[PDB]
Design a protein around this motif. Structure first.
Motif, PDB file in Angstrom:
ATOM      1  N   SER A   1       0.822  -1.105   0.159  1.00  0.00           N
ATOM      2  CA  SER A   1      -0.140  -0.084  -0.084  1.00  0.00           C
ATOM      3  C   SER A   1       0.775   1.241  -0.015  1.00  0.00           C
ATOM      4  N   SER A   2       2.139   0.985   0.639  1.00  0.00           N
ATOM      5  CA  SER A   2       3.103   2.075   0.307  1.00  0.00           C
ATOM      6  C   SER A   2       3.569   2.272  -1.021  1.00  0.00           C
ATOM      7  N   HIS A   3       3.400   1.448  -1.919  1.00  0.00           N
ATOM      8  CA  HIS A   3       3.967   1.304  -3.096  1.00  0.00           C
ATOM      9  C   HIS A   3       2.842   1.295  -4.159  1.00  0.00           C
ATOM     10  N   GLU A   4       1.769   0.315  -4.184  1.00  0.00           N
ATOM     11  CA  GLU A   4       0.899   0.257  -5.049  1.00  0.00           C
ATOM     12  C   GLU A   4      -0.305   1.482  -5.277  1.00  0.00           C
ATOM     13  N   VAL A   5      -0.685   1.822  -4.089  1.00  0.00           N
ATOM     14  CA  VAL A   5      -1.508   3.077  -3.979  1.00  0.00           C
ATOM     15  C   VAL A   5      -0.650   4.352  -4.465  1.00  0.00           C
ATOM     16  N   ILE A   6       0.677   4.395  -4.062  1.00  0.00           N
ATOM     17  CA  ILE A   6       1.684   5.596  -4.689  1.00  0.00           C
ATOM     18  C   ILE A   6       1.690   4.921  -6.175  1.00  0.00           C
ATOM     19  N   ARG A   7       1.666   3.984  -6.679  1.00  0.00           N
ATOM     20  CA  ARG A   7       1.716   3.775  -8.131  1.00  0.00           C
ATOM     21  C   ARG A   7       0.223   3.847  -8.897  1.00  0.00           C
ATOM     22  N   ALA A   8      -0.915   3.450  -8.085  1.00  0.00           N
ATOM     23  CA  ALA A   8      -2.184   3.675  -8.664  1.00  0.00           C
ATOM     24  C   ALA A   8      -2.350   5.127  -8.680  1.00  0.00           C
ATOM     25  N   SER A   9      -1.892   6.091  -7.815  1.00  0.00           N
ATOM     26  CA  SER A   9      -2.185   7.333  -7.972  1.00  0.00           C
ATOM     27  C   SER A   9      -1.221   7.744  -8.998  1.00  0.00           C
ATOM     28  N   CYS A  10       0.019   7.236  -9.241  1.00  0.00           N
ATOM     29  CA  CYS A  10       0.754   7.499 -10.248  1.00  0.00           C
ATOM     30  C   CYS A  10       0.106   7.066 -11.456  1.00  0.00           C
ATOM     31  N   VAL A  11      -0.543   5.787 -11.631  1.00  0.00           N
ATOM     32  CA  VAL A  11      -1.280   5.510 -12.558  1.00  0.00           C
ATOM     33  C   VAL A  11      -2.349   6.525 -12.860  1.00  0.00           C
ATOM     34  N   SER A  12      -2.976   7.147 -11.939  1.00  0.00           N
ATOM     35  CA  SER A  12      -4.031   8.208 -11.853  1.00  0.00           C
ATOM     36  C   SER A  12      -3.367   9.265 -12.501  1.00  0.00           C
ATOM     37  N   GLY A  13      -1.797   9.623 -11.879  1.00  0.00           N
ATOM     38  CA  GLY A  13      -1.116  10.722 -12.754  1.00  0.00           C
ATOM     39  C   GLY A  13      -0.708  10.411 -13.994  1.00  0.00           C
ATOM     40  N   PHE A  14      -0.639   8.985 -14.227  1.00  0.00           N
ATOM     41  CA  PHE A  14      -0.369   8.493 -15.559  1.00  0.00           C
ATOM     42  C   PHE A  14      -1.938   8.897 -16.375  1.00  0.00           C
ATOM     43  N   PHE A  15      -3.018   8.616 -15.609  1.00  0.00           N
ATOM     44  CA  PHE A  15      -4.464   9.186 -16.121  1.00  0.00           C
ATOM     45  C   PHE A  15      -4.537  10.806 -16.275  1.00  0.00           C
ATOM     46  N   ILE A  16      -3.831  11.312 -15.353  1.00  0.00           N
ATOM     47  CA  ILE A  16      -3.833  12.770 -15.267  1.00  0.00           C
ATOM     48  C   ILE A  16      -2.909  13.342 -16.575  1.00  0.00           C
ATOM     49  N   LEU A  17      -1.828  12.683 -16.751  1.00  0.00           N
ATOM     50  CA  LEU A  17      -1.007  12.887 -18.065  1.00  0.00           C
ATOM     51  C   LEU A  17      -1.280  12.043 -18.991  1.00  0.00           C
ATOM     52  N   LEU A  18      -2.683  12.199 -19.618  1.00  0.00           N
ATOM     53  CA  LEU A  18      -3.330  11.410 -20.515  1.00  0.00           C
ATOM     54  C   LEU A  18      -4.114  12.096 -21.531  1.00  0.00           C
TER      55      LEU A  18
END
Lengths: 166, 362, 330
Positions: A1-18
């Motif tokens: 959760s310190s990584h995946e939620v930091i990566r899913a928000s990064c995936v959301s940031g990938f969804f933000i930078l999309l």
């Protein structure tokens, strides 16, 4: 959760930078995030998948292109179906159905709320149940309970409940 | 004991090496057609007993393929077509003897493949008179491995459809699908023999293709396309080849319906629906593999089959109404469009079927 | 108008076909054919019924006949115009009968190449055969051919390509080298026709002691043919050509006299020899008796060993076959 939620928000940031570029690139990452199953938070990663699969209906050009594939990747994650694969994700998936239901006051309650009676049912069609109205009914009754039902969530539920059943 | 009958198998191959030294003789094989006549001396003599014996060359061994190897020696050079007729008396006599070996007790299975090797090698009318012989002598109530030899009979007719106007394809248009309703059936090689029977359905043209097919066979083949991945297994290259043959076989109505469009089609979109998703069951799975360099060719095969399916993606949409679906195959069509836009960028290929599929999937 | 500009611009192209000494003028007409490639991308495609199907397509075949007319020696615009000719009817989702007519146009030359066994002349008609060699790239670019060979298409004319490998000059053999290898790249296991042509290619390649561009293209074909070497073929045709390669193994000094790609193709043939060893055998001493000549050929490459080492690596691959055949059982 310190990584995946930091990566899913990064995936959301990938969804933000999309526009669709990272939305094509993280589509490969989301479909391979399903390969990272068999964990305690894998049901949360499936929730991170299914909410992204709920968000796969949002862009609806390359993400809905990935959606049934992610639902097949969820079916690939479905080696054997489970109650946490059935129920505990469902109200969390209905929480995503409760996300856009906050701003669901358009003058298309015969159309968009019936599309909300369809796009939620399309995720249930991605869940691919035969009693997908009635099998999801007690969860939605728990979810309409989780909805405040002040002014907008109530009739959007009850008319869709009048759509799905009597 | 010095050695068992594997030494005889070492001798039968050495007898096939004697057949290969006979095959290492020379060019055009009138002498081997005379050896096929010397085979026809034996081949007439087998059913001359008609009592508890067999075709002794086929009853000699199993792996010894001298019936094919002398026919391979008979493929020395074309002089002229009576070599493609002299073993015809060797053909139908042992075939009637194999028909006199009916119900296939313990030695009649291997006959039809020898006949298929006889069908494939050289028949001017030596297949056509054999087809005139098999019109008087054929029994199709087959079994598991006998489905393959029945497709070896289907392998003959398209090979017999070669010469100048195919010369018996209208006679083969009599030999129609009236016995071919035995699919949803035996295993992957037999499904590859059913794909060979579909290759026979990718054959028997407008003389009978506008009669036999009627788009209820391709839907039964769409059930077979469901069956090939499900009714058996271990068809990793085989169902891939069966799809690649179906990629030819679905495209076998290309100039047919684009001549006068008779086609007898009742359900003209059911077979194209589930198979294109079944393409994505392998090709979007290969786009889940998504490699650039081929493995050796098995990656390059299915991708060329996907490039063939790219034409098939351009095929149904160019005539029929796309996106008029009911099930989640339209939801898989976006995943097929995800497989498309991947493979369209990954094509670097023929721009006609690229841009058409860029408007077909989208 | 569309038929009339076809009676004008292709007539202007016939005025461009009235002078073939191009110098960027027929290439500008090829740029106009590139504009006609845009115009064939614009219109004259997916048109009305059998009359109109025979109206402009025959006029495009009349344009193809004039394209067949301007063979020598402008192959650059001709291969370019063949690409738009491939692009002509392919996007129409129809006119594969016109491609079956174009197959019969190719099958017309099959009788002509059969006639070349009886009588042949005319290097310009060999340039029309080289225009047909541009059609071999177009037959490679036909790409519904494996769908067409189910109706007994150029799978048949692969033997005509093998007949083009029969009458095979250093232009014609390299023409025969590519598209057959491309048809080998399409699929394998034809009914024993080209296995006869294989030794008619392989052993005659040792006979061809010059024309290195034909030899390099044959090694380019052998790059596909050693790739085509596989264990799913005629169960006896392979070993005889393997013995014919073992016959050719006594004379591989010309394979070293041919500089590199033939020796590499011979190494690829040695790779195919180990690939024949990688298959089943069914001839116990006959493999080894072929291997003793192959070990002599290994010793022959060890005799002239001044340049080659991939052949020695192929001999090491043969040693890898020899180590496999050293003491594997007991």
């Amino acid at each position: 959760s310190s990584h995946e939620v930091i990566r899913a928000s990064c995936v959301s940031g990938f969804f933000i930078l999309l526009q669709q570029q990272n939305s094509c690139n993280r589509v490969p990452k989301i479909l391979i995030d399903k390969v990272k199953d068999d964990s305690d938070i894998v049901k949360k990663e499936f929730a991170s998948i299914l909410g992204q699969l709920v968000c796969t209906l949002h862009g609806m050009f390359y993400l809905t292109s990935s959606l049934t594939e992610p639902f097949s990747e969820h079916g690939h994650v479905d080696l054997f179906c489970r109650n946490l694969k059935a129920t505990s994700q469902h109200e969390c998936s209905s929480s995503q159905l409760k996300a856009s239901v906050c701003k669901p006051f358009l003058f298309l309650l015969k159309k968009k709320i019936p599309s909300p009676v369809k796009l939620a049912f399309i995720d249930n069609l991605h869940h691919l149940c035969k009693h997908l109205d009635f099998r999801e009914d007690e969860t939605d009754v728990k979810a309409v309970l989780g909805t405040l039902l002040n002014l907008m969530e109530d009739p959007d539920k009850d008319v869709r409940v009048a759509f799905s059943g009597n | 004991m010095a050695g068992t009958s594997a030494p005889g198998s070492k001798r039968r191959s050495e007898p096939p090496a004697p057949r290969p030294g006979p095959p290492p003789g020379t060019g055009h094989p009138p002498s081997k057609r005379a050896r096929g006549f010397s085979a026809a001396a034996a081949p007439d003599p087998d059913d001359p007993f008609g009592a508890h014996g067999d075709f002794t060359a086929d009853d000699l061994e199993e792996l010894d393929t001298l019936a094919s190897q002398a026919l391979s020696q008979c493929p020395a050079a074309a002089r002229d077509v009576s070599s493609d007729h002299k073993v015809h008396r060797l053909l139908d006599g042992m075939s009637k003897n194999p028909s006199g070996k009916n119900r296939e007790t313990v030695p009649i299975k291997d006959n039809f493949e020898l006949e298929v090797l006889q069908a494939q090698y050289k028949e001017l009318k030596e297949k056509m008179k054999v087809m005139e012989e098999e019109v008087l002598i054929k029994n199709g109530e087959i079994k598991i491995l006998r489905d393959s030899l029945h497709q070896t009979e289907s392998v003959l007719e398209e090979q017999r459809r070669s010469h100048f106007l195919l010369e018996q394809e209208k006679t083969q248009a009599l030999s129609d699908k009236e016995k071919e309703f035995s699919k949803k059936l035996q295993s992957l090689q037999s499904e590859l023999q059913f794909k060979d029977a579909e290759m026979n359905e990718l054959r028997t043209k407008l003389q009978t293709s506008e009669r036999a097919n009627k788009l209820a066979a391709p839907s039964v083949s769409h059930v077979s396309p469901r069956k090939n991945p499900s009714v058996v297994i271990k068809p990793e290259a085989c169902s891939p080849q069966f799809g690649k043959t179906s990629f030819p076989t679905k495209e076998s109505f290309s100039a047919n319906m684009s001549l006068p469009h008779p086609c007898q089609t009742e359900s003209g979109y059911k077979p194209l629906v589930g198979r294109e998703d079944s393409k994505p069951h392998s090709l979007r799975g290969d786009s889940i593999k998504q490699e650039e360099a081929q493995k050796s060719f098995v990656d390059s095969w299915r991708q060329r089959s996907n490039t063939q399916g790219s034409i098939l993606i351009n095929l149904l949409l160019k005539q029929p109404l796309i996106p008029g679906s009911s099930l989640s195959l339209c939801h898989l069509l976006s995943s097929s469009s995800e497989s498309p836009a991947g493979t369209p960028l990954q094509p670097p290929g023929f721009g006609s079927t690229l841009a058409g599929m860029s408007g077909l999937r989208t | 108008g569309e038929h009339g500009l076809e009676l004008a611009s292709m007539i202007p192209a016939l005025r461009e076909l009235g002078s073939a000494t191009p110098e960027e003028y027929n290439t500008v007409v090829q740029k106009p054919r590139q504009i006609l490639c845009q115009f064939i991308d614009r219109i004259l495609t997916d048109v009305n019924v059998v009359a109109v199907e025979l109206v402009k397509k025959t006029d495009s075949q009349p344009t193809s006949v004039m394209l067949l007319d301007f063979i020598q020696h402008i192959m650059k615009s001709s291969p370019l115009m063949f690409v738009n000719v491939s692009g002509s009817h392919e996007a129409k989702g129809s006119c594969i009968e016109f491609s079956n007519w174009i197959i019969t146009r190719l099958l017309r030359i099959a009788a002509t190449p059969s006639c070349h066994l009886l009588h042949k002349k005319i290097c310009e008609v060999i340039c029309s055969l080289l225009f047909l060699f541009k059609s071999k790239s177009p037959a490679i670019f036909g790409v519904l051919t494996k769908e067409l060979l189910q109706l007994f298409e150029d799978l048949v004319y692969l033997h005509r390509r093998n007949v083009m490998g029969h009458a095979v000059e250093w232009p014609v053999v390299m023409s025969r080298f590519l598209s057959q290898l491309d048809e080998h790249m399409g699929y394998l296991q034809s009914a024993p026709l080209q296995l006869m042509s294989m030794q008619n290619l392989e052993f005659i390649e040792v006979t061809l002691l010059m024309v290195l561009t034909r030899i390099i293209a044959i090694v380019f074909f052998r790059r596909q043919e050693l790739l085509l070497w596989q264990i799913g073929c005629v169960l006896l045709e392979y070993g005889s050509p393997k013995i014919k390669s073992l016959a050719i193994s006594f004379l591989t000094e010309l394979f070293q006299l041919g500089g590199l790609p033939a020796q590499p193709a011979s190494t690829f043939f040695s790779s195919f020899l180990e690939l024949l060893k990688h298959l089943v055998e069914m001839d116990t001493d006959q493999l080894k008796l072929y291997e003793e000549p192959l070990s002599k050929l290994i010793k022959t490459l060890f005799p002239f060993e001044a340049e080659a080492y991939r052949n020695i690596e192929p001999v090491y691959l043969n040693m890898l076959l020899e180590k496999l055949c050293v003491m594997f059982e007991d």
